[PDB]
């Protein structure tokens, strides 16, 4: 050598963290505010590297951390314009509903005419209002935080969003097909712009979302540890579809100058308890396939038992169905199911109006009702379980479905990504000796 | 199925000498000392790192699957029942001496 030369545009990269922007594919405002997302490319590049191997871990990945922060901000932005339901916590004289699940009653509140009081009737669910003492109730969450109703215009439909890296940066992914959660993968391809991700919210059974191929991938921070949750990923889509047969009726209630509060109004039609149904034979064998995968990872006999208990948001499967927030048992699926027809498993459950989602300090939110029955299908593509163990157990290693921090939902779909900085400057030895 | 053992089960050493205790176990190991009727306290975590508030002369070392805890120049109040703490597994300790 003995003479230096500089090369521009060489394949060198090193780990780094950087902000990423959104992108949407293809009239009505969205909670995700996708109208600001730039249009997606017609055909994203999928360059593939052949003789390079890289290792990365999703648990320490910063991509999931950034997503969790911005999603919170979007909901904060969404609820800012529309009004907040502060003037509704009074002595709610509620006795019963003519049509222990639905309560019909009225609250004595004033709109104008300061020295005047006029009542208005509204319908609330039993769990929405807590007893104050007999025949006296009160709004649940207004001794801890202010309730704000979701703006009627926006919609909760989750559409795919691409977190697309900036210029001068690359995102590395590998499809190892039985890709382990952590460790080196020898088939890495550089994609400039990620693919569609659906911001879905759930607590027990991950829904919609992408699937795997010829595998049942089990991912967790550490198998031995108990606190760490286990994320199962299924290659088979077990469809789950259900409706709310009851018929609502929208109604507007004045609360102040230019402020409107939409209540449940009047119930029309016979009452029919909501429920969700799931195929029996399809689900029964689905857990058996998962059980076989868990048998080798643990070597011991496995039994599924229902969740121990806790808050209603973690002990019951939850999701969004056309602006209605559900909370269902899912107790018949994971009870006494030791694994070593047209029957369908029905899962009766009820609805909640005020939801404490995005668990944080002093923050609530109210979901306005929607008129008419709602139907929504969905795909089950992963179970979130928390292993119950004290050791010294002849096999009998019990697994209990549960939940956890919200980021665990998205880690199952971001499990192969790494945003990396690119350094195209290179110095090598050569006998040039520039003239 | 993390496992551990306590070979000696009985420890005796005169004051002012060097005495050691070992707990062969897999995974992370933590050492605690328990007075009579009171709660334990943490000496070291991850096998080597020292907790704040534990007086000097208490340190630990790791060699493969075995963990070293070195105790030297004994003075009063140091008598304790030392045990190794795996995630959800604790084995009985041993009163040091007096």
């Amino acid at each position: 050598g003995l003479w230096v030369t500089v090369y521009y545009g060489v394949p060198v990269w090193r780990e780094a963290k950087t902000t990423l922007f959104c992108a949407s594919d293809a009239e009505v405002h969205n909670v995700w505010a996708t109208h600001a997302c730039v249009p997606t490319d017609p055909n994203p590049q999928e360059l593939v590297l052949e003789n390079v191997t890289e290792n990365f871990n999703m648990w320490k990945n910063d991509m999931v951390d950034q997503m969790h922060e911005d999603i919170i901000s979007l909901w904060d932005q969404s609820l800012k314009p529309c009004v907040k339901l502060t003037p509704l916590c009074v002595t709610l004289n509620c006795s019963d509903a003519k049509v222990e699940e639905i309560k019909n009653c009225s609250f004595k509140a004033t709109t104008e005419l300061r020295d005047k009081k006029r009542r208005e009737y509204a319908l609330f669910y039993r769990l929405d209002i807590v007893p104050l003492s007999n025949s006296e109730y009160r709004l649940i969450n207004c001794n801890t935080s202010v309730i704000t109703q979701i703006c009627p215009k926006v919609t909760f439909d989750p559409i795919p969003i691409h977190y697309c890296a900036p210029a001068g940066y690359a995102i590395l992914k590998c499809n190892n097909k039985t890709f382990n959660g952590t460790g080196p993968c020898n088939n890495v391809s550089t994609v400039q712009c990620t693919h569609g991700i659906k911001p879905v919210v759930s607590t027990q059974l991950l829904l919609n979302g992408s699937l795997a191929e010829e595998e049942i991938i089990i991912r967790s921070e550490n198998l031995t540890d108990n606190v760490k949750t286990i994320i199962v990923h299924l290659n088979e889509s077990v469809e789950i579809t259900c409706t709310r047969p009851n018929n609502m009726t929208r109604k507007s209630v004045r609360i102040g100058p230019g402020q409107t509060f939409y209540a449940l109004g009047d119930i029309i039609g016979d009452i029919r308890q909501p429920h969700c149904n799931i195929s029996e034979i399809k689900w029964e064998k689905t857990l058996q396939r998962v059980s076989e995968k868990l048998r080798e990872h643990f070597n011991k006999t496995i039994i599924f038992n229902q969740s121990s208990g806790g808050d209603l948001e973690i002990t019951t499967h939850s999701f969004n169905c056309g602006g209605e927030f559900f909370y269902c048992n899912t107790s018949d699926l994971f009870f006494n199911k030791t694994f070593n027809t047209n029957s369908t498993i029905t899962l009766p459950c009820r609805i909640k109006q005020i939801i404490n989602m995005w668990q944080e300090v002093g923050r609530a939110m109210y979901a306005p009702p929607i008129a008419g029955n709602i139907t929504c299908k969905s795909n089950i593509t992963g179970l979130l379980l928390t292993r119950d163990g004290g050791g010294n157990n002849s096999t009998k290693e019990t697994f209990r479905p549960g939940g956890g921090n919200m980021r665990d939902n998205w880690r199952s779909e971001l499990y192969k990504y790494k945003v990396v900085e690119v350094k195209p400057l290179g110095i090598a030895p050569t006998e040039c000796n520039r003239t | 199925d993390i496992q551990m053992t306590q070979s000696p089960s009985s420890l005796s050493a005169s004051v002012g000498d060097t005495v050691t205790i070992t707990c062969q176990a897999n995974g992370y190991l933590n050492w605690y000392q328990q007075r009579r009727g009171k709660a334990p306290k943490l000496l070291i975590y991850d096998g080597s790192k020292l907790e704040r508030g534990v007086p000097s002369r208490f340190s630990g070392r790791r060699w493969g699957q075995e963990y070293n805890l070195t105790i030297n120049n004994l003075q009063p109040e140091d008598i304790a029942t030392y045990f190794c703490q795996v995630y959800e597994f604790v084995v009985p300790g041993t009163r040091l001496d007096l």
């Epitope: 921070e221 550490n222 540890d225 108990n226 606190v227 969740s307 121990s308 208990g309 806790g310 808050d311 948001e313 973690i314 668990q359 300090v361 928390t386 119950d388 163990g389 004290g390 157990n393 009998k396 019990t398 209990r400 549960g402 939940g403 921090n405 | 992370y28 933590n30 334990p40 306290k41 943490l42 975590y45 991850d46 907790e51 703490q85 795996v86 995630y87 959800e88």
Partner: nanobody, 121 residues
Framework: QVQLLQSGAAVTKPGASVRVSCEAS????????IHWWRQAPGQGLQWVGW????????????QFQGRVSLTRHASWDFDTYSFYMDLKALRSDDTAVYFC????????????WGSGTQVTV
Amino acid sequence: QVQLLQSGAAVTKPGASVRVSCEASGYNIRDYFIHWWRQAPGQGLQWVGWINPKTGQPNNPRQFQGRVSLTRHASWDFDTYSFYMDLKALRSDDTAVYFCARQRSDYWDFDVWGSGTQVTV
């Protein structure tokens, strides 16, 4: 990490129920897990379970499953979180002292412990 005071001593006849309360004020309770330990006379420590302060999700061994129930009741302010531990059935070997611990990080280490609550039968 100012204090982790526990309830007082109590005695209950067989078949009764015993309540033990653990309170934490100093540190942020919504960030670190809480574990419960047991120690019968003339024996080493024993594990009862852990409860997540964020969402009240318990986790207990097989032997204590169906008997112990861990509950958390935050005060009006997000401080002085109260952690409870209730059991239904009693046995002659349940005579022990129960402590209140705290998990710091991925490393299962505990630096703050409660005084203790001896319970007999």
